[PDB]
Amino acid sequence: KIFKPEELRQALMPTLEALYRQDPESLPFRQPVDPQLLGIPDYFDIVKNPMDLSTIKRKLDTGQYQEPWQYVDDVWLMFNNAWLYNRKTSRVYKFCSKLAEVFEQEIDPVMQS
């Protein structure tokens, strides 16, 4: 399968918009984690490949995703980073789990069509 980066933007962005629409749950994920602001100097040691909603959006806008699984992989990376770093009792971990539930519902059909 070959994929038109504009047809992939138009097909995938509604799945990304679905994540942005979650308030408060998307708020920690809208910009890159800043360990200095959050006071977590070990973050970049634990998380080798950061990802966040703004980075995925800019990649989608710059035609960075040759095929859609590459997009799906970045969304799951963002989730797995937050689950790795954060305690299970934490607000951000629980927010992550909510976003992943939203993403699974939204991406399911899209990757069918």
Ligand SMILES: Cc1noc(C)c1-c1ccc2c(c1)nc(CCc1ccccc1)n2CCN1CCOCC1
């Ligand atoms: C994602 C992610 N993965 O691990 C962590 C930690 C995060 C993360 C990532 C970001 C998180 C955040 C958690 N909690 C807040 C709000 C509470 C806060 C705590 C310390 C200092 C400031 C705020 N944010 C901040 C969200 N702001 C909202 C406004 O735009 C900038 C980020």
